[PDB]
Write an enzyme that holds these catalytic residues in place. Structure first.
Site, PDB file in Angstrom:
ATOM      1  N   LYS A   1     -58.501  88.536  49.193  1.00 16.52           N
ATOM      2  CA  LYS A   1     -59.405  88.831  50.273  1.00 16.52           C
ATOM      3  C   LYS A   1     -60.222  87.828  50.924  1.00 16.52           C
ATOM      4  O   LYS A   1     -59.989  87.481  52.053  1.00 16.52           O
ATOM      5  CB  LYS A   1     -60.488  90.128  49.439  1.00 16.52           C
ATOM      6  CG  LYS A   1     -59.921  91.067  48.705  1.00 16.52           C
ATOM      7  CD  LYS A   1     -61.169  91.638  48.181  1.00 16.52           C
ATOM      8  CE  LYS A   1     -60.556  93.105  47.978  1.00 16.52           C
ATOM      9  NZ  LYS A   1     -61.106  93.870  49.050  1.00 16.52           N
TER      10      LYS A   1
ATOM     11  N   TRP B   1     -59.198  97.532  38.912  1.00 18.13           N
ATOM     12  CA  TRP B   1     -58.440  97.545  40.172  1.00 18.13           C
ATOM     13  C   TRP B   1     -57.672  96.604  40.688  1.00 18.13           C
ATOM     14  O   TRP B   1     -58.141  95.398  40.881  1.00 18.13           O
ATOM     15  CB  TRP B   1     -59.497  98.062  41.310  1.00 18.13           C
ATOM     16  CG  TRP B   1     -58.636  98.331  42.462  1.00 18.13           C
ATOM     17  CD1 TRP B   1     -57.984  97.607  43.346  1.00 18.13           C
ATOM     18  CD2 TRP B   1     -58.382  99.730  42.979  1.00 18.13           C
ATOM     19  NE1 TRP B   1     -57.426  98.380  44.296  1.00 18.13           N
ATOM     20  CE2 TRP B   1     -57.658  99.457  44.337  1.00 18.13           C
ATOM     21  CE3 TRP B   1     -58.761 101.129  42.483  1.00 18.13           C
ATOM     22  CZ2 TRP B   1     -57.153 100.679  44.996  1.00 18.13           C
ATOM     23  CZ3 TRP B   1     -58.364 102.243  43.159  1.00 18.13           C
ATOM     24  CH2 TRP B   1     -57.537 101.940  44.714  1.00 18.13           C
TER      25      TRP B   1
ATOM     26  N   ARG C   1     -72.391  98.396  45.843  1.00 14.32           N
ATOM     27  CA  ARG C   1     -71.469  97.010  45.753  1.00 14.32           C
ATOM     28  C   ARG C   1     -72.108  96.343  47.104  1.00 14.32           C
ATOM     29  O   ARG C   1     -71.778  96.655  48.193  1.00 14.32           O
ATOM     30  CB  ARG C   1     -69.932  97.269  45.915  1.00 14.32           C
ATOM     31  CG  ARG C   1     -69.591  98.047  44.624  1.00 14.32           C
ATOM     32  CD  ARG C   1     -67.800  97.862  44.553  1.00 14.32           C
ATOM     33  NE  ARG C   1     -67.126  98.379  45.523  1.00 14.32           N
ATOM     34  CZ  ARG C   1     -65.859  98.214  45.953  1.00 14.32           C
ATOM     35  NH1 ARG C   1     -65.131  97.317  45.080  1.00 14.32           N
ATOM     36  NH2 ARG C   1     -65.224  98.750  47.110  1.00 14.32           N
TER      37      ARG C   1
ATOM     38  N   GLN D   1     -61.931  89.068  44.711  1.00 16.99           N
ATOM     39  CA  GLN D   1     -63.126  89.366  45.217  1.00 16.99           C
ATOM     40  C   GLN D   1     -64.266  88.141  44.778  1.00 16.99           C
ATOM     41  O   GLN D   1     -65.023  88.083  45.199  1.00 16.99           O
ATOM     42  CB  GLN D   1     -63.872  90.802  44.868  1.00 16.99           C
ATOM     43  CG  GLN D   1     -63.057  91.898  45.171  1.00 16.99           C
ATOM     44  CD  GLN D   1     -63.832  93.252  45.287  1.00 16.99           C
ATOM     45  OE1 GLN D   1     -64.944  93.237  45.633  1.00 16.99           O
ATOM     46  NE2 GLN D   1     -63.118  94.252  45.396  1.00 16.99           N
TER      47      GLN D   1
ATOM     48  N   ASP E   1     -57.464  87.819  37.956  1.00 22.06           N
ATOM     49  CA  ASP E   1     -57.486  88.463  39.473  1.00 22.06           C
ATOM     50  C   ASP E   1     -58.940  88.174  40.080  1.00 22.06           C
ATOM     51  O   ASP E   1     -59.848  88.727  39.847  1.00 22.06           O
ATOM     52  CB  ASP E   1     -56.998  90.016  39.546  1.00 22.06           C
ATOM     53  CG  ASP E   1     -57.279  90.855  40.611  1.00 22.06           C
ATOM     54  OD1 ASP E   1     -57.468  89.853  41.893  1.00 22.06           O
ATOM     55  OD2 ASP E   1     -56.824  91.719  40.998  1.00 22.06           O
TER      56      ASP E   1
HETATM   57  C1  LIG Z   1     -60.820  98.908  45.058  1.00 23.88           C
HETATM   58  C2  LIG Z   1     -60.242  98.879  46.395  1.00 23.88           C
HETATM   59  C3  LIG Z   1     -60.609  97.472  47.007  1.00 23.88           C
HETATM   60  C4  LIG Z   1     -59.560  97.775  48.465  1.00 23.88           C
HETATM   61  N1  LIG Z   1     -59.775  96.583  46.269  1.00 23.88           N
HETATM   62  C5  LIG Z   1     -58.843  95.922  46.318  1.00 23.88           C
HETATM   63  C6  LIG Z   1     -58.437  94.822  45.397  1.00 23.88           C
HETATM   64  C7  LIG Z   1     -56.989  94.365  45.118  1.00 23.88           C
HETATM   65  C8  LIG Z   1     -56.355  94.795  46.186  1.00 23.88           C
HETATM   66  O1  LIG Z   1     -55.921  94.219  47.299  1.00 23.88           O
HETATM   67  P1  LIG Z   1     -55.261  94.947  48.545  1.00 23.88           P
HETATM   68  O2  LIG Z   1     -53.774  94.717  48.264  1.00 23.88           O
HETATM   69  O3  LIG Z   1     -55.678  96.016  48.675  1.00 23.88           O
HETATM   70  O4  LIG Z   1     -55.612  94.015  49.657  1.00 23.88           O
HETATM   71  C9  LIG Z   1     -56.622  93.627  44.085  1.00 23.88           C
HETATM   72  N2  LIG Z   1     -57.779  93.090  43.186  1.00 23.88           N
HETATM   73  C10 LIG Z   1     -58.976  93.415  43.159  1.00 23.88           C
HETATM   74  C11 LIG Z   1     -60.050  93.238  42.229  1.00 23.88           C
HETATM   75  C12 LIG Z   1     -59.412  94.452  44.093  1.00 23.88           C
HETATM   76  O5  LIG Z   1     -60.605  95.009  44.377  1.00 23.88           O
HETATM   77  P2  LIG Z   1     -61.931  97.139  47.371  1.00 23.88           P
HETATM   78  O6  LIG Z   1     -62.641  96.892  46.079  1.00 23.88           O
HETATM   79  O7  LIG Z   1     -62.192  96.102  48.245  1.00 23.88           O
HETATM   80  O8  LIG Z   1     -62.796  98.394  47.811  1.00 23.88           O
END
Ligand SMILES: CC[C@](C)(/N=C/c1c(COP(=O)(O)O)cnc(C)c1O)P(=O)(O)O
Ligand SMILES: CC[C@](C)(/N=C/c1c(COP(=O)(O)O)cnc(C)c1O)P(=O)(O)O
Ligand SMILES: CC[C@](C)(/N=C/c1c(COP(=O)(O)O)cnc(C)c1O)P(=O)(O)O
Ligand SMILES: CC[C@](C)(/N=C/c1c(COP(=O)(O)O)cnc(C)c1O)P(=O)(O)O
Ligand SMILES: [K+]
Ligand SMILES: [K+]
Ligand SMILES: [K+]
Ligand SMILES: [K+]
Ligand code: NA
Ligand code: NA
Ligand code: NA
Ligand code: NA
EC number: 4.1.1.64
Lengths: 431, 431, 431, 431
Positions: free
Chosen positions: B270, B136, B404, B244, B241
C-alpha cells in the site's frame, strides 16, 4: 555498455529470481515497437513486453492521459466513485456483447480470475473448478489451482475440487473416431469422467479462447459452443479468460465474438491496461445481482482507482478510433504469410497457427514425424536476440518448442518485414 | 453537483458491487490531504485513500517521476531488467534490517502475500499456514485462506492446512493467569492446540505487526519475539505483512524494527506504492537461494515493471529526505493527544490505540461495561462525512466499532486540528 | 408366514435404512446354497449372501471350527499373539505369490483397503490416490474417496488428491485407434492427464481385477501389466483389491495369478472370511520393513483376533483340500454355457462375461443397439425371487443393468441347472 | 513353552507390525478374567482383551448363542432381514433413551463412527467435523481425521474441515478465570475460535464421554450439556462415541445417561460385541427419515448379519439379567478404593480417576510437581506382566503415563483383590 558491473553486482545480490533467466542487457528506454539497451541498440519487441503493450511502448496518448491524472485524481478510498471509473465500466458494457453488463476494475490478470472464480462459487453455492490441462490463469491460489501448463509441483495441495480436461489440439490429435480427430467426442468423453469424479459441486469452467502459454492453441470450430452447453447442462458458469486475447489482438474486439458464444464472466487484463496494471471482469446483470444479494466481496486497495481506469478508457478510445482491430487482421495476415514462407524454406518449422496478431510457430525436428526439436528452439531464440529481435518460446512435454509472436497492434509494415528477416537469419545461423 | 443522474444511472447499471456501499458523491480531484467532490467541496482524507497515499494525493514529486517514465520506460518483458528495478530492490535491501537481502517487485498486497506464501511452502516442503483470527491478508486464494477477519463463508473450502490462533488483544483480554492477562501463556496454549492438529506440515505463520482491519490491534511487548521462537522451534517461517505498517507510518521505517525481530519474509504494498499498484517481498539471501534451487516461480505480467518501480524509489527518497518517519511520531503524537481529549469529553470513546500515524478509536456504549455501541459508529461516520471529514470504521463480533485513522505522513498541524474539530462535532451531533 | 406384523412393525420403527430396499421376507435359516424364509421356502442363493459365502451357508467345518474357538480363545488384547493368527498369516504368505510375505488381519473390506492406503502413503511420503471410475472399495473415508461407481454426492469433499481414470470396457468401448479399441492407448492417454493434474504426490493406484459393482468388468489382456508399469514408472504402489475375486472364485487362488502380475499390496476380505468378518492385507517384506521404520500404525480392536483368524485358516484348508479352485472352473463353465444358451433364446441378453464363478449378464433392449433395458432388469429380478432364486442387479449410467452371479464354490451341478431354469422362466414371464 | 522358535520365526517373517510391540508369549486359551500362555500360566486380564470382553472370555452363554447360529443363520445378502437383527435393533431403541429410535448394525468401532459422520454430513449438507484434541475414534479416513491423540503425521492431509478443541482436563487445568479452572469458559473460548475459522460448514461434534486413549479423561459436570447447546446453536449434530463406555462399564447402561444429555447419534462397538466384531449407531427417527429421503447409503458386506446380531442380543440379555451395570458400580468401587490405598503408599501415583469399571491411574514423578514419570510407567507395566497381570499404559505429551484399567463386568471380588496385590508388588519392584 550493458556490462555495468555495479548494476550486475546489485542485480545478483538483491533480486529474487522468479522464473526464467534475466536477459543480459540493460533496458534503458522504449518507444513504439522497440526497446533500447544501454548501448543504444534497438530491439524489435515482438511480444509487446510481456504480451500487453497493444499500443506499443510509450504511446503519446497514454502518456498524456497518464500525466493528466497523476496530477489530478490518483488513488481513492475504495468506496468513492469518480468518472473514469464509471466511464470505463460503461464503456466496457457497451463494447462487449449483450449479456455482459457490469464491470469490476482491478489490477492484475490473476486477480481478475480470482474475482471471477470467487463470484462463481458464491452464486452457485458450489466449489469445483474445471480448466484445461495446458492452461495458465495466474500465480495466486485459485488462479494457480486452475493453471495446468506449469507450476503444480512442490508447493503443497491445490485447491479442493480442481479438475482439468485435455484441450482440443488439432496439430497433435490424440482422440479418434472413425479414423478422424473428433474433438467434440473427446469433449464428451472428458466430461463423462469429470461427472463421475465430481462430488456434485461443479461451479465453473475457466478457459482461454486461445491457450497462449499452452502453445498458442486455438479452440476449434464449434468447440466453444459445445463447451458452453456442457456447462449449462451442469449448472456451471463459463469464465473466459481473455487476458491475451481481448481488446483486438485476434482480429475481433474479443475472441468470444468470433464464435458467437458469450461467457458468463469475462476477464481482461494485459492488453486492457496496455502495460499498466489494470484488469477487469465483466458479467451479466443477473449474475451480479445475485452475487450482490449473497454478499459478494472483493475489496482491494486499487479496485476502482481513477488513474488506471483513465488509462484503460484511453486505450479503448484509441483502438476504436484507429481501427486497430481491423489493422490486426491486415498486419496479422502480412505476418502469417511470411511465416508460411519461412516454413517453405525450413524443415524445422512444423506449424504456424493463431489468429490476427497472436501467432505461434512450432519448432520441430522433422515435419513428418513432428518430433520436438530440443535445443534448436533455444538456439534460434538466442540468435534472434543477437540480431535485435525479441522473441519468446514456450516448451511443453510432448510438443515441439513454440514461438509466441505478439507485436503491437500499432506495428508497421516495415517492422513486420524486419522481424521476418531477422527471424529467417536467426534460423539460418542456428541450424 | 454530485447528483449527475446520468452518472448515477450508469453506476447503477454497470458496476459490480464488491463490498460496502458507494459514497454518494463524485470525486472530481484530489490534492495533498484532501479530495474534492463535484460541488468543489474539500474532504479531509483521514485514511490516505484506501490506507496508501503516504505522501498525500498528487504529490508533485510522484507526479514528475510518473511523467518521466511514462514517456521513457513503461513496461517490459518480465525477463528484461532496467535501473529503476535494480535501484529499488537495492534500496530495499539497504533500508530493511540485516537479513533482508533480496526483493521481488509485484503489484498488489494479496499478490505479495501469495508470493511469500508460495515461497515458504517451496522451501519448507510443507503447506500448513497459521495466521491470526482477525487478520486480513487479501482476497486471492491463499491470501484469503489466511484472512480471518472476514470473507470465509459461502465461497467453498479454504486451502488445506489453514489454521488461526487468537491475536493478543489487551483491551478485551480473554486469557488469564493469576488474575492477569497473560498473552504469552495464551500464545503457548494456542500453539499446543495447533501442534496437536497439524499433520506435521507447518510451513509459516503470517502476521500483521498491527492488525488493521482487525481493529488496530497492536502486538504487545515481547509477543513477536516469542512468536518468532515458536516458529523457529517448529521449523516454520515467519512472514510479516507490513502493507499498512511499512514505510514510516508507525514511526519506524518498518514496524518490525520496533521489536527488533526480523521476519523471514517481509511483504509490502500500500504505502510503498503510495497509491499506485506496486508491492514487494523481501527475504534473506539464503532463503532466496534455496527457493531458486528448488525452482521457485512467480512469473507475472508486471513483475519488474519499470514505471511502478520508479515510483516506489521516489517515494522512499522523499520519505527519507524529509524525515517523514520522524514526522509520523510528532503528528501522531499531536493526533493522539487530541483523541485522548475527546475521550475525556465523551463516554462512548472506549479506547485510543495504535502507533505513529496508524491510530484506532474504539466506540463503546459505556467505558465501564465496554459494551459495543451499535449504530452509533455509523452515525458518527455519516456526520463526519457531512462535516467534510472522511473516516472509516470497522466492526467485528464482540468488539465495539473502530475508527481507523491514517492521514498522510505529509499531513499538517492544521489539518490535524481540523480533523480533530470535525470529529468532535460529529460525535456531538450523533449522540 | 413372512407377514409377521410385529416383525415388520419393528423393522419399520427401528432400523436405519442404508441403501436399497429390504426383501419382503423373513429369513429363518440357511444351509449350503439355500436360504429359507419363514414359510420354509428355499431360495437358491446365487450371490453367496453378500458375495462372501464361498463354502455355502453353515458349512459343517466352519461350524466346528467356530465352536472350538468360541469356547477356547475368543478375543485378545491387540498386542498378544496366538497360533491361529500366526498360522493364517503364514498360510497367506505361502499361497500368495512370491513377493507377498507379510500379513495384517483385520475385519472388513473397507478396513483392509484403508490399511493398504495408509501404508502406501506412509512409505511413499505422498498422498494422491488413483482408482477406476466405476470402482467400489468401501464406505469409509479413504476407501470411499476411491470409490467411484456410486456414493460421491452430498457428503462433502472427498479426500484431497483423489483421481479416477476410465476402466477398460470392451463391451462398450469409447476409445479408438485405427478403427480399433485400443485400451492400452486409452490407458496412456488417461495417465497423461493424471500426470498433468498431479501435485507431484502420486502414492498408489487401487484396483479390482474384475470390477464387480462396476458391472463385472474384466481387465483385458495385458492391461494389468501395462498398469503396473505406469505405476512403477511413477514411483507408485499398486494395490489390488481382491475382496470378491480372491480365494478361488475366478478359477485361480487369486486373480492376479492369472495375469502373472503381483501387486505391491493385496487386500482380501469377503471370501476370505466366508461370511464372517475377517479381512487382510498382504505385502512384501521390504514394504513392511519400511512402513515399520516409519512408524506404521493401524491398531484396532479386532486386529489379530483368534476366532476369526481360525475361521479363515479353515476356509483355506477346505478350499485347497477339496480342489474348489478347480471346481470353480468346471461349474463356472457349466453356468456360462447355460447363460450363453439363454442368450441364444432371448434378445435382451446383450452380454455374458466374467470368469470362473464370478459372472455377469448385461440386460439390453436390443443386441444391436445395445441399448439399456430400463425396468426390464428389475422385472426379471422380481420374477426370480418369486421363482425362488436370489439374484442381484447393478445399474450404472450408460450401461444396461447387470446381473452379478456368484454362487458358492460348493454349488452342485443340480443347483446350477436349477438356477438356470428359474432364470429362463423369470425372463419369460418378464417380457 | 512360550519359546516355540518356529512360532517366533513365522511371526517375524509373516506379520505386518501395526503399532506397539508383541507380548513375548503365546496365548493358548482364555476363560473368564484370565488368559493362559503356553506354559499354562494364568494372566489376569485387566483390560478385557482390547477393552471389549465385558462378559469375560468365553462366556458360556455367548458360546451357546454362537454355536446355535453358526449352524443355522450365518451371513446374508445385505438386503435380507432376519430376527436377530430386528430384535437387536428393537432392543437397542428400548434401552437407550428416548430420542434414540433407529439402529444400523455394523462391524467395527471406526466403521460405526464413519457411518455416523457420513449421516451427519448428509443431513446437514455440511462437512466440517470437530473433536477433542486427545480423542480416538478409529484408523479409517474420517474416523482418523477426527482422532487427535495420535496418528496424524506422515500419512498426508486429513479430511478437509477437520478441527479440534482442548478437552476439559481437571487434573492438569490450563484455562483460568478468577483463579479458577473455568472449563466452561474454556469451552466458549474454544468455540469462538472455531467459529472464526469455519467456512460456515459445521456439521457435527464427535466426542467420547470419557476419553479413554486420551488418558481416561472424564467430561466434568455440566460440560456435556453446555457442549450440546453449543452444537444446537450452530445447527450441528452431536455424536457420542460410546465404544468403551457403553453397555454398563461406567455404572450406567450408557454414559450419556449420567449427564442426562442425549446425543443426536450414538455409536457403539467394543463392549457391545463383547469380543466379536459388532458395532452400531443409534439415531432419532427424524434424523433417520431425513437421511433416508436424502439417499443415505452405507451398504457393507456384514451390515445386518445375523450371527453377530445374535451375539449382541445375548450380551444385552445377560447384562440386564445379571444386573451387571449395578455390579460395575460395586466392583468399581472396590477397585477404586484399592487404588486409592496404593496412592497412599506410593508417591508416584498422582491421580486415580474414572467411573465404574473404567478407571485410570496417572503415574507421576512427584505428587506436588505432577511431573511425568518417564520410564517408570513402562517398568511397572513389565513387572505386572511378570507377576501375571495384564495392564496397559498410554502416554501423551505433557501428561504422566496412564494405566487404563477395565476388567470384565463379571470380574470377582477375588480377582479384584489379586490384581490389586499384583500391582502393588509391581510398583514396589519397579521403584
Ligand atoms: C482490509 C481491506 C483492506 C483493502 N486491506 C487490504 C490488505 C491487504 C491486501 O491488499 P490488496 O491486495 O487489497 O491490495 C494485504 N494486507 C493487509 C494487512 C491489508 O489490510 P484495507 O485495510 O485497506 O481496508
Ligand atoms: C504464462 C505467463 C504469462 C505471464 N501469463 C499470464 C496470464 C495471466 C496472468 O496475469 P498476471 O497476473 O501475471 O498479470 C492470466 N491469464 C492468462 C491467459 C495469462 O497468460 P505470459 O503468457 O504473459 O507469459
Ligand atoms: C485407542 C485404540 C483402541 C484400539 N481404541 C479404539 C476406539 C475406536 C475404534 O475401534 P476399532 O475400529 O479399532 O474397532 C473407536 N472409538 C474409541 C473411543 C476407541 O477407543 P483402544 O482404546 O482399545 O486401545
Ligand atoms: C459394492 C458393494 C459391496 C457391499 N462391495 C463391497 C466391497 C468392498 C467393501 O467391503 P465391506 O467393507 O463392505 O465389507 C471392498 N472392495 C470391493 C471390491 C467391494 O465390492 P457388494 O459388491 O458386495 O455388493
Ligand atoms: K481504490
Ligand atoms: K514485466
Ligand atoms: K485383538
Ligand atoms: K449382510
Ligand atoms: Na455488453
Ligand atoms: Na536489509
Ligand atoms: Na507369497
Ligand atoms: Na431409545
Amino acid at each position: 555498455l550493458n556490462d555495468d558491473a555495479t548494476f550486475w553486482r546489485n542485480a545478483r545480490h538483491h533480486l529474487v529470481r522468479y522464473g526464467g533467466t534475466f536477459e543480459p542487457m540493460i533496458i534503458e528506454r522504449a518507444k513504439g515497437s522497440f526497446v533500447y539497451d544501454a548501448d543504444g541498440r534497438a530491439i524489435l519487441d515482438f511480444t509487446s513486453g510481456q504480451m500487453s503493450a497493444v499500443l506499443g511502448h510509450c504511446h503519446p496518448e497514454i502518456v498524456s492521459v497518464i500525466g493528466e491524472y497523476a496530477g489530478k485524481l490518483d488513488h481513492l478510498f475504495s468506496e468513492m466513485l469518480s468518472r473514469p471509473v464509471v466511464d470505463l465500466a460503461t464503456r466496457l458494457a457497451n463494447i462487449t456483447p449483450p449479456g455482459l453488463d457490469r464491470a469490476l476494475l482491478l489490477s492484475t490478470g490473476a486477480e481478475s480470475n480470482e474475482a471471477a472464480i470467487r463470484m462463481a462459487k458464491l452464486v452457485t453455492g458450489k466449489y469445483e473448478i474445471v480448466g484445461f490441462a495446458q492452461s495458465w490463469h495466474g500465480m495466486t491460489g485459485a488462479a494457480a489451482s486452475a493453471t495446468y501448463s506449469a507450476g503444480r509441483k512442490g508447493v503443497g495441495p491445490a485447491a479442493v475440487g480442481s479438475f482439468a480436461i485435455p484441450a482440443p489440439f488439432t496439430y497433435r490429435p490424440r482422440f479418434e473416431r472413425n479414423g478422424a480427430y473428433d474433438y467434440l467426442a473427446e469433449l464428451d468423453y472428458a466430461f463423462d469422467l469429470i461427472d463421475r469424479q465430481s462430488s456434485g459441486n461443479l461451479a465453473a469452467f475457466i478457459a482461454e479462447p486461445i491457450l497462449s502459454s499452452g502453445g498458442i492453441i486455438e479452440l476449434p470450430d464449434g468447440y466453444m459452443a459445445a463447451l458452453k452447453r456442457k456447462c449449462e447442462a451442469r449448472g456451471m458458469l463459463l469464465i473466459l479468460d481473455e487476458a491475451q486475447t481481448g481488446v483486438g489482438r485476434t482480429g475481433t474486439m474479443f475472441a468470444c465474438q468470433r464464435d458467437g458464444v458469450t461467457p458468463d464472466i469475462l476477464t481482461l487484463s494485459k492488453t486492457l491496461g496496455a502495460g499498466l496494471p489494470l484488469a477487469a471482469i465483466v458479467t451479466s446483470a443477473a449474475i451480479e445481482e445475485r452475487a450482490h444479494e449473497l454478499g459478494y466481496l472483493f475489496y482491494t486497495t486499487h479496485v476502482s482507482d481513477p488513474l488506471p481506469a483513465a488509462v484503460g478508457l484511453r486505450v479503448l478510445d484509441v483502438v476504436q478510433r484507429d481501427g486497430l482491430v481491423a489493422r490486426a487482421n491486415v498486419m496479422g495476415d502480412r505476418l502469417r504469410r511470411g511465416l508460411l514462407d519461412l516454413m517453405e524454406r525450413f524443415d524445422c518449422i512444423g506449424d504456424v497457427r493463431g489468429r490476427g496478431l497472436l501467432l505461434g510457430v512450432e519448432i520441430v525436428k522433422d515435419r513428418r514425424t513432428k518430433e520436438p526439436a530440443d535445443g534448436l528452439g533455444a538456439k534460434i531464440t538466442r540468435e534472434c536476440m543477437n540480431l535485435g529481435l525479441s522473441m519468446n518460446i514456450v516448451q511443453l512435454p510432448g510438443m515441439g518448442g513454440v514461438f509466441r509472436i505478439a507485436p503491437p497492434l500499432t506495428v508497421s509494415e516495415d517492422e513486420i518485414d524486419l522481424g521476418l528477416s531477422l527471424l529467417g537469419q536467426a534460423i539460418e545461423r542456428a541450424l
